[model samples]
Target: GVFNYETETTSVIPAARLFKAFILDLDNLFPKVAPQAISSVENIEGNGGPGTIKKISFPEGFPFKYVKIRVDEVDHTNFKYNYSVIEGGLIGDTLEIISNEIKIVATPDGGSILKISNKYHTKGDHEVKAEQVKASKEMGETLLRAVESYLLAHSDAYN
Candidate 1:
């Protein structure tokens, strides 16, 4: 079976600055944003660009230790990113994969919107309810704000 979920989180930060500083550089941005949540991000294989396999390690008392995701695309000009979690953490035993796409768009008010799309592919009779992914998005929005807050403070950071 296959599942798709979508969410758009708004931010007061400008799209170009937010996308360039946070989302595109998640490996370097995560820990700074929420050290309480994400411990670190490591590139176990390939470079930081496309084809890279990033290991996202969480802190203690979390759902899982890590989620391994491969970078599929990094469109700098378009402020978009595509990746897929192939193994570990977020993936259940019966879950084949979870693919994700992220887009940052500039709002007229100089803010931004994080347009996210997630697809969960399950094997056999496995299942996941929307109730489950709900928190996933909630957490995602939290993280975004954390990063935005950090950047807002530094001002000189993540240009």
Candidate 2:
């Protein structure tokens, strides 16, 4: 069965700053926080727009040699970033592909609320296990948390 997941996380960060970090700094920040899971992220095609391909590698022996994701859409004003995984071990026998979108919105307290969602597409009589689903959600949260922690410590970041 196909499924979609969303995570709404509150942060003590400003919306625009948080959005900027997610859009422009993810490649820079991923390794600083989770080098084992994400060794590097680089744009291999285009110029940071739609159709740009990003390959993310992991440390040593992860199932994924690298994950190639294509930037589907990016909007600064709306604080939205969308991408889809096109290749690598993130794809599975039951899983066809995964699409992820992140949006940031301002809150009255001057902080931000991050809305991250993922859509799972599957092929032919496939059922995704709960473990996989949990891992997927956790991955997003872990990345966000790392960014948040960094920003909190370095308050001037992403300003």
Candidate 3:
């Protein structure tokens, strides 16, 4: 079975900056911005393009050890990124795959909107729990907020 979810988060930063910090620069920037949750993001395959595989390792005391995700699509001009989770304890026993697409659009006020879509491919008709979905969504938004704060405080970054 497959389940889908969508969410949107607004940001004061423009789309270009947000995209650069969140998508293009994730491998290097995630560890710098959120060392607590993410210890490192290492490229395991490809050259940071479509089909590239990256492993995100967590620090000690973290619930899950590591998660590997593959880049599915990246559009720099449009500020859109798509990726799929390929391996990790985060997948647990229920999900077969988790695919996500994120697009940042600029507003007239110089702000940006993060539109995210998630697809959960469950194994054997298993249903994704509400709490699991809520937690994941909140974690992502929290990360983005942290990045937004970091960029706001450091204007020279991600330029």
Candidate 4:
């Protein structure tokens, strides 16, 4: 028994600009756009580079409270990064299981295609499944909107 979920959003922004905005400026930029959803994301260890460990805490009402993720892999050439939960959250526990993967591909149209897939499994008769699904969708949309807004505001930089 397994649950599979995938969500993607694509927009037209120059490749270099999108990469810079998303990969290079994520830490400094993400919090500004959606501070309510993402309280803070700190690179507790490492140089905010590959293999860095980050503790991300969401605002109240976010699913699973707070979670810390370790950057497992990073490929700047492809604009991709893989992260795993190092602590906190309901992941890998008997009650619930959670895993996420994110990929950003440079498209022929000169924009980036951002895709995120999450696999989760839950035990017990709790109603957490619905909540998780709702939260995931909301977060996906919020991220897309935030990026769009960022690109719009920094069009000069992006161009």
Q: Which candidate is the best by TM-score?
A: 1
TM-score of 3: 0.92
lDDT by residue for model 3 (25-98), tens:
88887888888768998999888889899999988987688889989999998999999997986475878899
Task: State every prediction's TM-score relative to the real structure.
Answer: 0.93, 0.90, 0.92, 0.79
Alpha carbon deviation, residue 61, candidate 2 (Å): 4.2
Off by over 4 Å in 4: 92-97, 121-128
Tell me which residue pairs clash in candidate 1.
none
- Model 4 poorest 10 in a row by lDDT: 120-129
Write the residue-wise lDDT of candidate 1 on 71-132 in tens digits. Answer: 99988898999999899854668688999999999999999999999899988898876655
Candidate 4, residues 41-110: lDDT per residue as tens digits?
A: 7888986676788887888886556787777766668776666665676664643545667777778987
Model 3 lowest lDDT segment of ten: 86-95
List where candidate 3 sits over 4 angstroms from the true fold. 90-92
State which candidate has the highest lDDT. Answer: 3
Reference-based TM-score, model 2: 0.90
**lDDT values for all models:** 0.85, 0.82, 0.88, 0.71
User: How much is the lDDT of residue 68 in candidate 2?
Assistant: 85
**Better lDDT candidate (3, 4):** 3
TM-score pick, better of 1 and 2: 1
Which 10-residue window of candidate 2 scores lowest in summed lDDT? Answer: 86-95
